[PDB]
Design a binder for this molecule. Structure first.
Ligand SMILES: c1cc(-c2cnn3cc(-c4ccc(N5CCNCC5)cc4)cnc23)c2cccnc2c1
Ligand SMILES: [Ca+2]
Ligand SMILES: [Ca+2]
Length: 293
């Protein structure tokens, strides 16, 4: 087994999900996500996406191995990214135009890759993520990002027209839940519903990043979305009130409109945040717009 030969060196993330460790394997750093037995279905779902669908892309976290024994240990072993999550990186780092755009374009490219079905023996189904957020995005050494955590992924194939929703009781992070998830109007049997939930979350991530880009000597501090109106670890109900009832969206600072880049990002965000899921931009459209700037 790969698991047998790994030396675990330091814990770099703790939580309800489990833990993530920097470890060593054959003289190289690797990341080991150790799942609680409560989250066994997420482990299996990631394992199938990586090891059966062969999901691989420069902006998706690189799989190395999966191991389980049983009383029960469930390991997912991936490339290790020493800069940490986008959430970690944004707390200490400010950005310029080049590094801001490199970040958001890479996330869009990863998300477009998930969303688009590819045909052939080397292909893949269309995939929606369902827990996109800044903690589930890693910053790589080259300044681009990659998307992690496919435990809630749902798939669709045009040939069968089958929605593969899997069987996981876990639900998305509440802070990033789209209006239609919070008011339970989401059309659960339509694959496109899940893509539009990702786009909502992507919009929130764009906001998080854009705040940290310096323009005209000004930058905002890191805040999570809805920091001003819900507590830490907000409830389903806290979010429903803010997003559905009050129809609140994250505030766009007026200073952004005097910078061309932040002006473009502000326009994209707003078109990720429509209450009508159908009106939201596609991942491909976001990628194309970010490529044009
Ligand atoms: C497997 C592996 C990871 C994963 C891959 N690399 N990595 C680095 C970290 C990580 C997080 C934080 C830090 N540091 C924090 C303090 N300041 C310096 C950086 C350093 C590394 C966390 N998780 C991962 C992962 C990340 C999110 C979700 N699922 C995952 C599943
Ligand atoms: Ca084993
Ligand atoms: Ca922020």
């Amino acid at each position: 087994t790969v698991a047998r030969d790994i030396t675990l060196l330091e814990c770099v993330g703790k939580g309800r999900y489990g833990e993530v460790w920097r470890g060593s394997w054959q003289g190289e750093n690797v990341a080991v996500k150790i799942f609680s037995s409560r989250d066994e279905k997420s482990w299996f779902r990631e394992t199938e996406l990586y090891n059966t669908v062969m999901l691989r892309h420069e902006n998706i976290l690189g799989f190395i191995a999966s191991d389980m024994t049983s009383s029960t240990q469930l390991w997912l072993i991936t490339h290790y990214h020493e800069m940490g999550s986008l959430y970690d990186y944004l707390q200490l780092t400010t950005l310029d135009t080049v590094s801001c755009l490199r970040i958001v374009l890479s996330i869009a490219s990863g998300l477009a890759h998930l969303h688009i079905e590819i045909f052939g023996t080397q292909g893949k189904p269309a995939i929606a993520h369902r827990d996109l957020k800044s903690k589930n995005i890693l910053v790589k050494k080259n300044g681009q990002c990659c998307i992690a955590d496919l435990g809630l992924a749902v798939m669709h194939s045009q040939s069968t027209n089958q929605l593969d929703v899997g069987n996981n009781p876990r639900v998305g992070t509440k802070r990033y839940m789209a209006p239609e998830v919070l008011d339970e109007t989401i059309q659960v049997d339509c694959f496109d519903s899940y893509k539009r939930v990702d786009i909502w979350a992507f919009g929130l991530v764009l906001w998080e990043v854009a705040r940290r880009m310096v323009s005209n000597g000004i930058v905002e501090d890191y805040k999570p979305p809805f920091y001003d109106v819900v507590p830490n670890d907000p409830s389903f109900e806290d979010m429903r009130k803010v997003v559905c009832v009050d129809q609140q969206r994250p505030n766009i600072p007026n200073r952004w409109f005097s910078d061309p880049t932040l002006t473009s990002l502000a326009k994209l965000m707003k078109e990720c945040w429509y209450q009508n899921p159908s009106a939201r931009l596609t991942a491909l459209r976001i990628k194309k717009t970010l490529t044009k700037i």
